[PDB]
């Protein structure tokens, strides 16, 4: 057991972690900035500590401030949630230095899987398939670069090793723009992640983003909980995630899952992770791994009944895995929709006061959000304000429940992307299932 | 399926029926009174028809009005839900004769099981044990009455045959007040239900109200779906239900379920019904049967995964039961709390506008209600404004989840029994479980 | 009613050492800039200078009491 933990995050994940803590009887410390005093989890937390001013670089990315909050409150662990410092190896080792428990993998594990150039190598060593590509960082040897591009086959995509959030990616169709594309990708990587390293990979045009969720306790045990299907993306930022992935037969599911679990055992992984694969022609092609709880993880919770955050807390506390591989059973189909706060026709964030708010209810509808009537959405942080997960005995029931629950939801005073979700739900190809990662941009066409 | 149905009810059950209809691609007609034009299901329904003035006796109990509303809109079914006309055999026969499917049991079965004396006789015939009692309507032979009372053993209780809602029931300790109690209970029954028939039954002082859920398609098939322990009651009205009942081993569950399924097959039941019981010394004693979907069915839905109202709609359409008895599996534990708009101390209704409202959410928490910010709770109807169901992998997880959810719920502008529910949740004996049907009243210490 | 607020999360101390004299007290005033109190976080004692010349109207947090970012520490004038 953990006596007390610090929720070093905000918004929906902070509520999730606080609520799991309350269930497990763990005392919660909610560190916030000076503009986050109004957050629902901050008002529901046992102790609250204002760690910095509004900007993220001064409040939530401030490792010393979070450590000081943990120190003064006498906490024993720190849950980073997702975003900010969840995948920060410096945060991991700096939290572990000071005698605090980092709820997540080890610092070395985050360093290894944190740069895709090394993660791909480790996966190839472990037998997990990977997309053919540069198989190494890109240098200035332009002749070698073009030879590699010819070998793999055009088109090609340049991806930053430290890239995240869908940025720092450029698609190159020919040698004409290769150098300029590489230069601009390096510049963006320098300006964003402080790492100009880039690598080139084959650009599959009809894949399906299928990711595996795995729980490992760091003691030689690891399990895999079904998968997901995040193929409904815009600008490489997911919009609708669902599990289990349609069309993935139990044979293929087990084949990929057991290999993922073996790979987890290979690197001595700990806590909850996620392997991201591209699905095409029945072959999986690893692209990256997320060493943290994923935003869309609630879909995996509603089909297996396994609370992932409580599993993370138990694993951090030292207890081994209490779930056997044979005990995991997929019963149903869940579909999630991220409700952002932005102009639906311009995808620009829209901060402002929420005058009316009414969350939907019903049998199998989960609403995961921190907003409430009279909550002023701040402009400093990301635009996501909630998630809506609907569950049913089959995909059609889940989609119908989603369509019903999207109409029953009211959010006034700010420009939110609920109508986009409603029109995505009504799309016929989506109802068919198995659409590709580029389908949504084609549907919008602009 | 049914082309269109009429929801001859209001409040939470109306939303439950509307949502089940929407998921199934069924059009909905929402009949309402003149004071219920702001109900959520009315504003979400496909069609709306006003059937009468504010009072229930003129609008929601006006069988001709509901039949007319079904006729003009071209409906093909009428779903009564619970209360009002759900257990009105006259309504069933009139609806079926007019040419509309009645979503529920047959008129004959409603007549048979509604009369508690005939229900007890049929249960004894079919092998269902019953509480020792008069075994028939009370006569004028006071000598025989007192002889039977002495034989079974005092105390005894006089219960109206057509009684409901916990009214028209009187407990008798000895022969002194038997005649006067019987006469006054008969007068009360005349005043309330227009039926003075009464019967006498043995009074068990430490029972546990256990009820079984049975689904039967009326074609010779019937199944049972776990049970529910509604022990926590005040004034003979349930406050907290849970499912499955603690301490009822799977052997007893299968035993009573097989007996109840056989009884349903024998009496030609159709639809969804509930067999109430009293549990003591490992033996059940039938008391009454509810020929309608119950207020606390969501707990059964959440532990078994079977949508009960959708099953009702499918059975009414004639489809045979697609769920076998071996395919019904109980997985977890659900606890439900009824939220009423009343004084937590004086237990009197508190109608009024709701100035703010922020419903609870999270993992494994269902909020089934019809209120919103600005809703004006009318004084003409029952005081229930919503139900709150929480599900977990065991009783303790579900109760902790319930505590969090109750702490998270906001209802202002009226007086609501939320603090009482929190108190019940915090009771140590309730957390241990197995409390008797009189525990809550004794908890008040009066 | 100028308020000087703590710039970091830590424990608030008056005396720079456990058995030394307090930096300031109500009454006696302070100049534009000078040490006013101590906030300790992760060890590494940090001294909070003053920004306004004026009289120490009041001090709101006792010694050893944890303080958060922008916690009202003292009121000057």
């Amino acid at each position: 057991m953990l006596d007390k933990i610090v929720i070093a995050n905000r918004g929906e994940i902070a509520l999730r972690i606080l609520r799991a803590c309350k269930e497990l009887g763990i005392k919660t410390v909610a560190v916030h900035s000076s503009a986050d005093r109004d957050l629902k989890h901050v008002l529901l937390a046992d102790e609250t500590v204002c760690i910095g001013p509004a900007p993220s670089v001064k409040s939530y990315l401030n490792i010393p401030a979070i450590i000081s909050a943990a120190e003064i409150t006498g906490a024993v662990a720190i849950h980073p949630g997702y975003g900010f410092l969840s995948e920060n190896a410096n945060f991991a080792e700096q939290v572990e230095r000071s005698g605090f428990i980092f709820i997540g993998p080890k610092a070395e594990t985050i360093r290894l899987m944190g740069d895709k150039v090394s993660a791909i190598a480790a996966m190839k060593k472990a037998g997990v398939p990977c997309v053919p590509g540069s198989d190494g960082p890109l240098g200035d040897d332009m002749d070698k670069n073009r030879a590699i591009a010819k070998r793999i086959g055009y088109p090609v995509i340049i991806k930053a090793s430290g890239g995240g959030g869908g940025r720092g990616m450029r698609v190159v169709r020919g040698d004409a723009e290769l150098a300029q594309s590489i230069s601009m990708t390096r510049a963006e990587a320098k300006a964003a992640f402080s790492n100009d390293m880039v690598y080139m990979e084959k650009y599959l045009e009809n894949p399906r983003h299928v990711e595996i969720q795995v729980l490992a306790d760091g003691q030689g045990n690891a399990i895999y909980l079904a998968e997901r299907d995040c193929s409904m993306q815009r600008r490489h930022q997911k919009v609708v995630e669902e599990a289990p992935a349609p069309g993935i037969t139990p044979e293929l599911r087990r084949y990929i899952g057991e290999r993922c679990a073996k790979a987890c055992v290979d690197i001595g992984y700990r806590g909850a992770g996620t392997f991201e694969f591209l699905f095409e022609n029945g072959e999986f092609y690893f692209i990256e791994m997320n060493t943290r709880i994923q935003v869309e993880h609630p879909v995996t919770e509603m089909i297996t009944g396994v609370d992932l955050i409580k599993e993370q807390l138990r694993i951090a506390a030292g207890q081994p895995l209490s779930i056997k591989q044979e005990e995991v059973h997929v019963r149903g189909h869940a579909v999630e929709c991220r409700i952002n706060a932005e102009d639906p026709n311009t995808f620009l964030p829209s901060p402002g006061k929420i005058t009316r708010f009414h969350a939907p209810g019903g049998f199998g509808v989960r609403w995961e959000s921190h907003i409430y009537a009279g909550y002023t959405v701040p402009p400093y942080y990301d635009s996501m304000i909630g998630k809506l997960i609907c569950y049913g005995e089959n995909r059609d029931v889940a989609i119908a429940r989603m369509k019903n629950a999207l109409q029953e939801l009211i959010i006034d005073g700010i420009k939110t992307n609920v109508d986009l979700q409603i029109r995505i739900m009504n799309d016929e190809n989506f109802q068919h299932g198995g659409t590709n990662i580029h389908y949504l941009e084609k549907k919008l066409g602009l | 399926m049914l082309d269109k149905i009429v929801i001859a009810n209001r409040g939470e059950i109306a939303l439950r029926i509307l949502r089940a209809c929407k998921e199934l691609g069924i059009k909905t007609v929402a009949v309402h009174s003149s004071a219920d034009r702001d109900l959520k299901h009315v504003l979400l329904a496909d069609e709306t028809v006003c059937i009468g003035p504010a009072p229930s006796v003129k609008s929601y109990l006006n069988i001709p009005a509901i039949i007319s509303a079904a006729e003009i809109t071209g409906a093909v079914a009428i779903h009564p839900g619970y209360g009002f006309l759900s257990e009105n055999a006259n309504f069933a026969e009139q609806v079926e004769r007019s040419g509309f499917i009645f979503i529920g049991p047959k008129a004959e079965t409603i007549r048979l099981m509604g009369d508690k004396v005939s229900a007890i006789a049929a249960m004894k015939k079919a092998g269902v044990p019953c509480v020792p009692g008069s075994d028939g309507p009370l006569g004028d032979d006071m000598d025989k009455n007192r002889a039977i009372a002495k034989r079974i053993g005092y105390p005894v209780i006089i219960k109206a045959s057509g009684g409901g809602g916990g009214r028209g029931m009187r407990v008798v300790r000895g022969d002194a007040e038997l005649a006067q109690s019987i006469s006054m209970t008969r007068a009360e029954a005349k005043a309330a239900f227009s039926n003075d028939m009464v019967y006498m039954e043995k009074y068990l002082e430490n029972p546990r109200h256990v009820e079984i859920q049975v689904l039967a398609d009326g074609q010779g098939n019937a199944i049972y779906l776990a049970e529910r322990d509604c022990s926590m009651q005040r004034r003979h009205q349930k406050v907290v239900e849970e499912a499955p009942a603690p301490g009822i081993t799977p052997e007893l569950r299968r035993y009573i379920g097989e007996r109840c399924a056989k009884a349903c097959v024998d009496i030609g039941y159709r639809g969804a019904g509930t067999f109430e019981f009293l549990f003591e010394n490992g033996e059940f004693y039938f008391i009454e049967m509810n020929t309608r979907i119950q207020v606390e069915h969501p707990v059964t839905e959440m532990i078994t995964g079977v949508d009960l109202i959708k099953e009702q709609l499918r059975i009414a359409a004639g489809q045979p039961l697609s769920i076998k008895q071996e395919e019904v599996h109980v997985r977890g534990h659900a606890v439900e709390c009824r939220i009423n708009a009343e004084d937590p101390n004086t237990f009197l209704p508190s109608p009024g506008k709701i100035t703010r409202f922020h419903a609870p959410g999270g993992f494994g928490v269902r909020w089934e209600s019809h209120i919103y910010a600005g809703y004006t709770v009318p004084p003409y109807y029952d005081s229930m404004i919503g139900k709150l169901i929480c599900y977990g992998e065991n009783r303790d997880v579900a109760i902790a989840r319930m505590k969090n959810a109750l702490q998270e719920l906001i209802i202002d502008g009226i007086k609501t029994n939320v603090d009482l529910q929190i108190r019940i949740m915090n009771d140590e004996n309730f957390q241990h479980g197995g409390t008797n049907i009189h525990y809550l009243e004794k908890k008040l210490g009066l | 009613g100028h308020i000087v607020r703590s710039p970091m999360v830590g424990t608030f101390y008056r005396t720079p050492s456990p058995d030394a004299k307090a930096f300031i007290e109500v009454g006696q005033k302070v100049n534009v800039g000078d040490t006013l109190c101590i906030v300790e976080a992760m060890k590494m004692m940090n001294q909070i200078e003053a920004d306004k010349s004026g009289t120490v109207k009041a001090i709101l947090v006792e010694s050893g009491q944890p303080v958060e970012f922008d916690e009202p520490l003292v009121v000057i004038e």
């Binding site: 629902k40 008002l43 529901l44 102790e47 609250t48 500590v49 450590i67 943990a70 120190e71 003064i72 409150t73 006498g74 906490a75 024993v76 230095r97 000071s98 005698g99 605090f100 409430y372 009279g374 | 703010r356 922020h358 702490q407 998270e408 906001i410 202002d412 | 424990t11 992760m42 060890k43 050893g64 009491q65 944890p66």
Partner: peptide, 21 residues
């Protein structure tokens, strides 16, 4: 309600050692 909450100060007597190094 939980919206109308007033922050209560932390308990001073809570120690969490941090290595000097």
């Amino acid at each position: 309600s939980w919206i109308e909450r007033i922050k209560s100060n932390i308990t001073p007597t809570r120690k969490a050692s941090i290595p000097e190094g």
